[PDB]
Design a protein around this ligand. Sequence first.
Ligand SMILES: [Fe+3]
Ligand SMILES: [Fe+3]
Length: 307
Amino acid sequence: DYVSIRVSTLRGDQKIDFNAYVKINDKMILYLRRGDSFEGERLKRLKDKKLRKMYILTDEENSYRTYLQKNIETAYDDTTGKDIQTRADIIQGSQQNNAEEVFENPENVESYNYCKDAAGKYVNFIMSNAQALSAVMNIENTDKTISHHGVTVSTLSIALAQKLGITDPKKTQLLTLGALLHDYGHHHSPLNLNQPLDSMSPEDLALWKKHPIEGAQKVQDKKHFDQTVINIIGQHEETINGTGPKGLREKDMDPLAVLVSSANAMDRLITFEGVPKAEAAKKLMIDHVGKHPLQHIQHLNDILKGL
Ligand SMILES: [Fe+3]
Ligand SMILES: [Fe+3]
């Protein structure tokens, strides 16, 4: 009768040609209506509801797929001059949805390859559109999900790669894909990520320390997983002074994981530890001295300042 859809796919100004329902106490309530769109403040209004999933009637699923398809086709289009925030709204949510799909179906080769293809599209979107990164950074991760957080980290990672002169398209795609999926270890975890690491109890911190190894272990034997992605999942918490969960130093790591580690540290502060964007870089330089290459943090500082 119903099929679920992820809320991150409801974005932009395209009018939906289906209704969507919320499930509460095992009943379906018509909440979004044919003709609705989600541009501007509506994104936050729906998002403030803290819903992950909504439902659509099976006889309208073709309408939903067509909606999705047009959203992506138009959002990635660099020729239309469509408002950059609307493009970013759609693309951010699509990347997020893609990551969720992989988290939920890690054995699904097709889901992984779709996400991988989309990660390459994301690189080009971010690098080609001057204001795309700032537009994406405007989309607050209010529900603190690892998928949204993956998108943010991948966004910063792309910009950092650009600053570092990393130009290989295969590397940037894999860096982005790994950043997207980096926190797979937290999937379905009972840990509340939305607290400072310095505030976690011994039990929460122990649980937290396992996530790179567990995330990596869960995908490392999957033949469709790229090694770069496995590396980033497993190594992204390592710091260059060997103070991360595994105690790896820079010399031990995939250089692309060192990059994601830097980008992640920034969003952890911003999204999970309540540090304002404009204070995060400085926070890392002083209170996280020596954990990440200073140059990475300086670049990230400039990235947030638009320099
Ligand atoms: Fe992590
Ligand atoms: Fe993370």
